[PDB]
Amino acid sequence: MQLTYVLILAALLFCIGIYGLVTSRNAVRVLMSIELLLNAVNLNLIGFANYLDGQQIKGQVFAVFVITVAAAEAAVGLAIILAIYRNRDTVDMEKFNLLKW
Template sequence: MTLQLLHFQLLSAALFCIGLYGVLARRSAVLVLMSIELMLNAVNVYVVAVAAFRGFESSTGQVIAVFVITIAAAEVGLALAIVMRLFRSRGTVNMDEIDVMRG
């Protein structure tokens, strides 16, 4: 049995589902963010794997992965700023207690 595309696809699916579990089950906003990072990584693995196994030389998958990483970095910065702000104004980062939309 040699290494094939299916292995990477299954790894990506498992990583994504673990991230999904984290997003659904965790209560702290920072932990939810970390789980979202896991899901983004799973998508990256999938895209890069499909691009690498396609059989001809194409850098599109890697470029898309670079963009995903860029957006993920921006997202983490913004989201953690929001978390800090929430913590200062509400005194908690528990997702269950943050249930209003006005500041």
């Protein structure tokens, strides 16, 4: 394990999150696929902190704030789905195309 192998792990963990962001049909599976993107920018970030600037970690501080944002973005993010499910009694991203043109 070197610096390079963490980045190709992070660059692959990003693009499974992209594939779930575009293809997934459940409204909640898009939120889990967003969280994969917000871990690949963490796995890139600590891996940039261990091998570069190891003495004063500016990446592991910046790795803390990404977790707290994405925990606050998934707390907001599921409040929205739970407002839709009380009005539209399904969660189907091919059913929310009523603001078409």
